[PDB]
Amino acid sequence: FVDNVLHQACRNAKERGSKVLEIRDIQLVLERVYNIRIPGYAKVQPNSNWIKKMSAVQAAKV
Amino acid sequence: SPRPRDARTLELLLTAQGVTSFEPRVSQLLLDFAYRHTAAVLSDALHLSSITANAVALAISSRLGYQFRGGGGGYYGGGGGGASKDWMLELARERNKVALPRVLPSEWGVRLPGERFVLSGVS
Amino acid sequence: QMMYVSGETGEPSLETTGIIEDIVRQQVIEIGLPWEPASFYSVEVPERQRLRKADERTKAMTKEEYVTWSEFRQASFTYRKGKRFREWAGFGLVTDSKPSDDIIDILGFLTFEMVQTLTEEALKIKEQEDLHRETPVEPRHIQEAFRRLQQRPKKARAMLNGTKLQQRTQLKLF
Amino acid sequence: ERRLKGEVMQLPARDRRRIKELAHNDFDPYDALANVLMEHALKMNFDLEIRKRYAQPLAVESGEFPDTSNIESRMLPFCYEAGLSSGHAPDAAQFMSIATETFIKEVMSAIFSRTRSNGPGDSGSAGFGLGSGWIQTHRYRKQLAKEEEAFQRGEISRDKMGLLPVEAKAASERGPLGMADVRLALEMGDCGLAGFPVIVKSVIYGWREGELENWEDYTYVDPSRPDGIAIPSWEGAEPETSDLLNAVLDSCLA
Amino acid sequence: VDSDEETAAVMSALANWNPQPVVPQPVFAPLKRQYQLARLHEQLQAATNGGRTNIFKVVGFG
Amino acid sequence: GYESTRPLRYGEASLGPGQPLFYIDDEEVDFEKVINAPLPKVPRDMTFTAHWLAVEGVQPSIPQNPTTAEDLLPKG
Amino acid sequence: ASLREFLNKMDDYAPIIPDAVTNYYMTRAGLPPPPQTDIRLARLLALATQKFIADIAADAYQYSRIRALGIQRPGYGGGGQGGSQNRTVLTMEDLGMAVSEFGVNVKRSEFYR
Amino acid sequence: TFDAPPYVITPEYILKKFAGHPPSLIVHLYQNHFRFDQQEGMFQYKSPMRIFIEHLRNRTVPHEIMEYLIQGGVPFYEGCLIVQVFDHRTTVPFSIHNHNPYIPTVYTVVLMPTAQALHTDLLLKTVTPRDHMELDPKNIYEVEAKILLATYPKLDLEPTKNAEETIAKLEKLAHPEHSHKPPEPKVRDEALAAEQERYMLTLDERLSSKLWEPRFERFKLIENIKQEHAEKKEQE
């Protein structure tokens, strides 16, 4: 577990342009890969093209 | 009758591989699987971030830790579970070192394992 | 005060109250009826252990201790603190401006129960730890209580039986 | 073969062009295996710091559960591998140790809840509280309720650990967790080990529990029995000095 | 556009399909072996001076 | 939901000249229609028969064998 | 609440699932049918299945009702003209919302191009 | 053409066939460490090279260091290794008061080849530049096949008529290397002086931690640097 979480978190930290490892990276890995939440350490919407396609399909369906 | 593209394409690809018949609802199953995989991968890549190619590669590598341990890979290809071959070789070395069991002609074909490992008193 | 009413008469440190506030804030940020049988139709026609322990403790209480308990019972996050609570909870960052007062009252009702549940579980964990060795509650007891409160009923994973899939969910709202 | 022509010509020319362009792909040299094969066959010298990861015993080797100090020793080589030249935050090792303890507790709880029954009740301070508990049988439930009421009336006393007589009696009958329980639990679900296939494969491929002790335990096929089963009720050449050399080598290995 | 030639080309292209991966497929093994082999390689590299010294050499006939 | 025995139909919409879109064809139905419908037909149970495919290297002309009308002998 | 009494009261608690379906799926799973297995055990299994389905229905009805800006959620393509009258329609969106709480993903594409 | 090995290889056959040849390896064993004949340093029994000693106990070829054996040109005799073992096993320290003027047995054994050794050989050949590499992976299986033909030219292909004959054949074809028993199950005053010693070592940087394998890495690095600098100077 340790030699696995650390490996993922360090590369994730380096991705976003960081020179240090922080608790946020470890938290992201732990919450998204293992469903583990540790307390006490401090949105997507469709755009216009999708709406246009949906409107076209609805108009065809009537 | 109308039919979407990539469906004719998947069916032609299946035919080219020696399949002489298939049920109608295989193409749409494959299309929906592709939709789900794409959505999951890019939703992962969004959090690691505009999204770059490095974020996509890292999301794919992370996903590869708990699924897709199959395929038709050969020499040092991660198929059949993904186990290393040296580990399997040493497990085989440990197992095959014991002498084969001694069986008399009067118990050949009739002897069973111990009571702990058989289905007695199960009804 | 809220901890005191729930049977914690010690003096908790800064870290314990800090972690409790963190948990409550996370919960608040994460947060007839429309689905009754009358809704089946298109026409509507108008009609026509905790308590026992608390009682034992209150009986054991004296006059001054009882008065202090009664005064402390009225602690609230929101009462006369609408602006402070709204700034604390980041209302404008998660919802449109100025939700009605009923929402504020409901949130005040919910936060108190959150704190009470957390305290009551942490006390039991602390006592069980004390027994096996042979003071107030500490952050590790709060961590154990939080871990307990995040477990889900087995009905929510029955469709993963026999397979090797990981269960991934959202934050449970205790 | 006249239907294939119609199927292919029902595709528009763009799709046909895209499909035909696959022939330009330069086959599969699979040269990328080389790296994998290699994996198996003024300035700061970061390699010197990174090579320190292998100078500490593993938990399985020392028999000790990892703590903040060991995790701190492990962190820095990982940071230098990834190009994090400023190290880690001061508060990361404690967070990691807490997470590791939480993970192990979850795994063990999942395994235990599938193979055990008749745990302590919620009468006071002992039990599973607001978490997930075990199953109960009718007789245990009846006796536990009776004893809880009796204690409430003041006629019963708990032991030094706070258990009632029925709870203590039930607890004393349990035993240590064995590999049969783990194997049974792994047939019900992942138990939180989906990301650790090696552990699962180690469990599955091993000897059965109690198999090596009872090597000569046998039953027989008997169609006249209830279940069809009958239960029985050069200097110093090797050949002339191998034993002496083996004694010396065993002394060396200790 | 001859239909026979088009069909032959399309089917021949589809018969030889072979996709390439973006990242390689991982291979798994226990941690103990990895640590032990790393330590052995360190020790042998130190002993042989990076390959400049033959310690297995035998002089004579035994 | 992919084990359905209903036929699979597709409808076509247009995003413009030469830009078609395809959607699955569905339609809202009543519960009375589904609940009151008859069941499919039960097939017969498994069984087996026997017959002579060949006798001493020659296939007999019996109803159980294929007809000569409808590449088996070498001609090199 | 004993198991013996419950199994003895199985006459009054039989579910609406026909015995043929029970036998077919028990055989698929690996249990011989009630001729050799007790009929009461099979009835109990069918009753558990009915209870599970009724739970999944009560939710998704709650979801449909609280739903009565304003665009659909991507990934739940289905439907036609949308029914008629002020009637409650079982849609893919509500079923997906409900079964996400049980650990099931039912997402699809709306169009295919 | 080559001579194939017998069905069961024994130390007697190898030691008699290959008399008059130099041994493959020579190892000296001491009280707490061992070395090789031409080695300068030492290996401790508690070090990773302990693995080699285990092979010496099991009469197996040490594939885990096969590369290092190929680099040094170690000879093989029908895939086995001949090893000679030499056996030498059979006041007031750190006190200023001390005074000062300036104040074996021999064994020979044979290690036999295994399947992991052949796997290692092929894997190493796959990554050894000579086509590019000595062996192309796509040709691996074929190569392996040929090797097998040269190792087992004869097989027992006669059939049996009943189970008794099969039992007799299994009895007759037993191999010593595969005739072991199943393994064993896994198993799990001075106090005052020790306390005083611990108390007297308080706030000690290094001695406290203990309550030692010198590799001379720094000196070797200095020697390498000096050699490189001397070579560079000689150029000018």
Coordinates of N, CA and C in Angstrom, one line a residue, chain D residues 30 33-34 37-38 40-41 207 212-213 215 234-239 241-242 244-246 248-254, chain H residues 11-12 15 18-19 21 23 45 50 53-54 56-57 59 82 84 87 89 106-110 123 126-127 138 182-183:
Chain D
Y30 N 7.4 -4.1 -32.2 CA 7.4 -4.3 -30.7 C 8.7 -4.1 -30.1
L33 N 9.4 -3.5 -26.1 CA 9.7 -4.5 -25.1 C 11.1 -4.3 -24.6
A34 N 12.0 -3.7 -25.3 CA 13.4 -3.6 -24.9 C 13.5 -3.0 -23.5
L37 N 12.3 -5.4 -21.2 CA 13.3 -6.5 -21.1 C 14.5 -6.0 -20.2
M38 N 15.0 -4.8 -20.5 CA 16.0 -4.2 -19.6 C 15.6 -4.2 -18.2
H40 N 14.2 -6.4 -16.6 CA 14.2 -7.7 -16.1 C 15.6 -8.4 -16.2
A41 N 16.3 -8.2 -17.3 CA 17.6 -8.8 -17.5 C 18.7 -8.0 -16.8
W207 N -0.8 -24.1 -0.5 CA -1.3 -25.3 0.1 C -2.6 -24.9 0.8
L212 N -0.7 -30.0 4.8 CA 0.7 -30.5 5.0 C 0.8 -31.3 6.3
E213 N 0.0 -31.0 7.3 CA 0.0 -31.8 8.5 C -0.5 -33.2 8.3
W215 N -0.9 -35.4 5.7 CA -0.5 -35.8 4.4 C -1.1 -37.1 3.9
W234 N 41.1 -34.9 -7.9 CA 40.2 -34.1 -7.0 C 40.4 -34.6 -5.6
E235 N 40.4 -33.7 -4.6 CA 40.5 -33.9 -3.2 C 39.2 -33.8 -2.5
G236 N 38.8 -34.7 -1.7 CA 37.6 -34.7 -1.0 C 36.4 -34.7 -1.9
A237 N 36.4 -35.7 -2.8 CA 35.3 -35.8 -3.8 C 34.0 -35.8 -3.1
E238 N 33.0 -35.3 -3.8 CA 31.7 -35.1 -3.2 C 31.0 -36.3 -2.6
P239 N 30.9 -37.5 -3.3 CA 30.1 -38.6 -2.7 C 30.6 -39.0 -1.3
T241 N 32.3 -37.2 1.0 CA 32.4 -36.1 2.0 C 31.2 -35.2 2.0
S242 N 30.1 -35.5 1.3 CA 28.9 -34.6 1.2 C 28.3 -34.3 2.6
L244 N 29.8 -34.3 5.6 CA 30.7 -33.3 6.3 C 30.6 -31.9 5.8
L245 N 30.6 -31.8 4.4 CA 30.4 -30.5 3.8 C 29.1 -29.9 4.2
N246 N 28.0 -30.7 4.2 CA 26.7 -30.2 4.5 C 26.7 -29.7 6.0
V248 N 29.2 -28.5 7.6 CA 30.0 -27.2 7.7 C 29.1 -26.1 7.1
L249 N 28.4 -26.4 6.0 CA 27.6 -25.3 5.3 C 26.4 -25.0 6.2
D250 N 25.8 -25.9 6.9 CA 24.7 -25.6 7.8 C 25.2 -24.8 9.0
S251 N 26.4 -25.0 9.5 CA 27.0 -24.2 10.5 C 27.2 -22.8 10.0
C252 N 27.7 -22.6 8.7 CA 27.9 -21.3 8.1 C 26.5 -20.6 8.0
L253 N 25.5 -21.3 7.5 CA 24.2 -20.6 7.4 C 23.5 -20.4 8.7
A254 N 23.9 -21.2 9.7 CA 23.3 -21.0 11.1 C 21.8 -21.2 11.1
Chain H
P11 N 27.6 -36.6 -9.2 CA 29.0 -36.1 -9.1 C 30.0 -37.1 -9.6
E12 N 29.8 -38.4 -9.4 CA 30.8 -39.3 -9.8 C 31.1 -39.3 -11.3
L15 N 32.9 -35.9 -12.2 CA 34.2 -35.8 -11.7 C 35.1 -36.8 -12.3
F18 N 35.6 -35.5 -16.3 CA 36.3 -34.3 -16.5 C 37.5 -34.1 -15.5
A19 N 38.2 -35.2 -15.3 CA 39.5 -35.2 -14.5 C 40.6 -34.6 -15.4
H21 N 41.0 -31.3 -15.6 CA 40.6 -29.9 -16.0 C 40.6 -29.0 -14.7
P23 N 39.1 -26.5 -11.9 CA 37.8 -26.4 -11.4 C 37.1 -25.1 -11.9
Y45 N 28.4 -13.8 5.7 CA 27.3 -14.8 5.6 C 25.9 -14.2 5.7
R50 N 24.9 -14.3 0.5 CA 24.4 -15.5 1.2 C 23.7 -16.4 0.3
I53 N 25.7 -19.2 -1.2 CA 26.0 -20.3 -0.2 C 24.9 -21.3 -0.2
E54 N 23.6 -20.8 -0.3 CA 22.5 -21.6 -0.3 C 22.5 -22.6 -1.5
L56 N 25.2 -23.6 -2.9 CA 26.2 -24.6 -2.6 C 25.7 -25.7 -1.7
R57 N 24.6 -25.4 -1.0 CA 24.0 -26.4 -0.1 C 23.1 -27.3 -1.0
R59 N 23.3 -27.8 -4.4 CA 24.0 -28.3 -5.6 C 23.2 -27.9 -6.8
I82 N 32.0 -27.2 -11.3 CA 32.9 -27.8 -10.4 C 33.4 -26.8 -9.4
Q84 N 35.5 -26.0 -5.8 CA 36.4 -26.5 -4.7 C 36.2 -25.5 -3.5
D87 N 38.3 -24.9 3.7 CA 37.6 -24.7 5.0 C 38.7 -24.4 6.1
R89 N 37.5 -22.8 9.0 CA 36.7 -22.6 10.2 C 37.3 -23.4 11.4
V106 N 39.7 -29.6 2.4 CA 39.4 -29.4 1.0 C 38.2 -30.3 0.6
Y107 N 37.3 -29.7 -0.2 CA 36.1 -30.4 -0.7 C 35.9 -30.1 -2.1
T108 N 35.4 -31.0 -2.9 CA 35.0 -30.8 -4.3 C 33.6 -31.2 -4.5
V109 N 32.8 -30.4 -5.2 CA 31.4 -30.6 -5.4 C 31.0 -30.2 -6.8
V110 N 29.8 -30.6 -7.2 CA 29.3 -30.3 -8.5 C 27.9 -29.7 -8.4
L123 N 17.0 -15.2 -22.0 CA 16.7 -13.9 -21.7 C 17.9 -12.9 -21.8
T126 N 18.8 -12.4 -25.4 CA 17.9 -11.5 -26.1 C 18.4 -10.0 -26.0
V127 N 19.1 -9.6 -25.0 CA 19.5 -8.2 -24.8 C 21.0 -8.0 -24.9
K138 N 11.5 -13.1 -31.7 CA 10.6 -13.9 -32.5 C 11.1 -15.3 -32.8
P182 N 7.3 -33.5 1.7 CA 6.6 -32.2 1.8 C 7.2 -31.3 2.9
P183 N 7.1 -30.0 2.7 CA 7.8 -29.1 3.7 C 7.1 -29.1 5.0

